[PDB]
Design an enzyme around this catalytic site. Structure first.
Site, PDB file in Angstrom:
ATOM      1  N   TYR A  27       0.886  -1.281   0.075  1.00  0.00           N
ATOM      2  CA  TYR A  27       0.024   0.181  -0.023  1.00  0.00           C
ATOM      3  C   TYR A  27       0.811   1.377  -0.115  1.00  0.00           C
ATOM      4  CZ  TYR A  27      -4.038  -2.733   0.291  1.00  0.00           C
ATOM      5  OH  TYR A  27      -5.302  -3.699   0.060  1.00  0.00           O
ATOM      6  N   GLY A  29       2.834   3.990  -1.394  1.00  0.00           N
ATOM      7  CA  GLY A  29       3.071   4.384  -2.875  1.00  0.00           C
ATOM      8  C   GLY A  29       1.987   4.089  -3.791  1.00  0.00           C
ATOM      9  N   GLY A  31      -0.755   2.524  -6.172  1.00  0.00           N
ATOM     10  CA  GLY A  31      -1.670   1.397  -6.007  1.00  0.00           C
ATOM     11  C   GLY A  31      -1.874   0.863  -4.619  1.00  0.00           C
ATOM     12  N   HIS A  47      -4.057   5.615   5.078  1.00  0.00           N
ATOM     13  CA  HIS A  47      -3.798   6.864   4.505  1.00  0.00           C
ATOM     14  C   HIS A  47      -4.479   6.737   3.206  1.00  0.00           C
ATOM     15  CE1 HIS A  47      -1.046   9.684   2.306  1.00  0.00           C
ATOM     16  NE2 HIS A  47      -1.410  10.403   3.551  1.00  0.00           N
ATOM     17  N   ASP A  48      -4.316   5.568   2.331  1.00  0.00           N
ATOM     18  CA  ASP A  48      -5.093   5.368   1.271  1.00  0.00           C
ATOM     19  C   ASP A  48      -6.575   5.679   1.412  1.00  0.00           C
ATOM     20  OD1 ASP A  48      -2.676   4.944  -0.028  1.00  0.00           O
ATOM     21  OD2 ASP A  48      -3.135   2.807  -0.381  1.00  0.00           O
ATOM     22  N   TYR A  51      -7.513   9.467   2.222  1.00  0.00           N
ATOM     23  CA  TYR A  51      -7.533  10.107   0.976  1.00  0.00           C
ATOM     24  C   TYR A  51      -8.786   9.782   0.290  1.00  0.00           C
ATOM     25  CZ  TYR A  51      -2.750  11.903   0.612  1.00  0.00           C
ATOM     26  OH  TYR A  51      -1.505  12.863   1.141  1.00  0.00           O
ATOM     27  N   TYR A  64      -1.009  22.094   2.279  1.00  0.00           N
ATOM     28  CA  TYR A  64      -1.466  22.816   3.569  1.00  0.00           C
ATOM     29  C   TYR A  64      -0.494  23.304   4.426  1.00  0.00           C
ATOM     30  CZ  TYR A  64       0.288  17.922   4.585  1.00  0.00           C
ATOM     31  OH  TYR A  64       1.193  16.980   4.640  1.00  0.00           O
ATOM     32  N   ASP A  89      -2.309  13.185   6.751  1.00  0.00           N
ATOM     33  CA  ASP A  89      -0.943  12.953   6.413  1.00  0.00           C
ATOM     34  C   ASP A  89      -0.132  12.966   7.612  1.00  0.00           C
ATOM     35  OD1 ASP A  89      -1.043  13.132   3.529  1.00  0.00           O
ATOM     36  OD2 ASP A  89       0.077  14.900   3.339  1.00  0.00           O
TER      37      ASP A  89
HETATM   38  O1  LIG Z   1      -0.457   5.668   1.661  1.00  0.00           O
HETATM   39  C1  LIG Z   1       0.670   6.310   1.078  1.00  0.00           C
HETATM   40  C2  LIG Z   1       1.614   6.688   1.804  1.00  0.00           C
HETATM   41  C3  LIG Z   1       2.882   7.119   1.395  1.00  0.00           C
HETATM   42  C4  LIG Z   1       2.937   7.225   0.178  1.00  0.00           C
HETATM   43  C5  LIG Z   1       4.325   8.094  -0.327  1.00  0.00           C
HETATM   44  C6  LIG Z   1       4.253   9.131  -1.237  1.00  0.00           C
HETATM   45  C7  LIG Z   1       4.821  10.007  -2.066  1.00  0.00           C
HETATM   46  C8  LIG Z   1       5.067  10.006  -3.228  1.00  0.00           C
HETATM   47  C9  LIG Z   1       6.007  10.888  -3.993  1.00  0.00           C
HETATM   48  O2  LIG Z   1       6.083  10.832  -5.412  1.00  0.00           O
HETATM   49  C10 LIG Z   1       6.686  11.932  -3.233  1.00  0.00           C
HETATM   50  C11 LIG Z   1       6.622  11.779  -1.709  1.00  0.00           C
HETATM   51  O3  LIG Z   1       7.390  12.512  -1.279  1.00  0.00           O
HETATM   52  C12 LIG Z   1       5.463  11.023  -1.144  1.00  0.00           C
HETATM   53  C13 LIG Z   1       1.915   6.827  -0.917  1.00  0.00           C
HETATM   54  C14 LIG Z   1       0.744   6.180  -0.248  1.00  0.00           C
END
Ligand SMILES: Oc1ccc(/C=C/c2cc(O)cc(O)c2)cc1
Length: 121
Positions: A27, A29, A31, A47-48, A51, A64, A89
């Protein structure tokens, strides 16, 4: 915004968001599918979902503002979307900090097809 999230992650954990959290588990990144691999991956799952709770916000790009009071992140008042993105975040960055003890480098670049199972938000 994504860059702000990355700086909050670095602040909290001392790990660079890229590569530590950009491609971790199922999870963290781009997808998400399957059962999260560990507690850190669960931070990304939630976190996904967080969002996902904000379908008419743009969490990747909308900026923010936050400060710290006695160490702790305090999201400052912007637009409603900005406040809600900041809370998502903040939670994930705290979650990463809380789970640094079990972070495992084996889950960086984890391959998508191993993401077996199912998890609803
Ligand atoms: O649930 C998640 C948690 C962390 C992330 C990471 C995201 C990310 C992607 C980028 O290109 C730059 C960055 O500084 C952070 C994505 C999903």
């Amino acid at each position: 915004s994504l860059l702000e999230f990355g700086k909050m992650i670095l602040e909290e954990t001392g790990k660079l968001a890229i590569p530590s959290y950009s491609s971790y588990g199922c999870y963290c990144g781009w997808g998400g599918k399957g059962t999260p691999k560990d507690a850190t991956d669960r931070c990304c799952f939630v976190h996904d979902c967080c969002y996902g709770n904000l379908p008419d916000c743009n969490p990747k790009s909308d900026r923010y503002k936050y400060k710290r009071v006695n160490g702790a992140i305090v999201c400052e008042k912007g637009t409603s979307c900005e406040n809600r993105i900041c809370e998502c975040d903040k939670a994930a960055a705290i979650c990463f900090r809380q789970n640094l003890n079990t972070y495992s480098k084996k889950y960086m670049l984890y391959p998508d097809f191993l993401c077996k199972g199912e998890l609803k938000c």
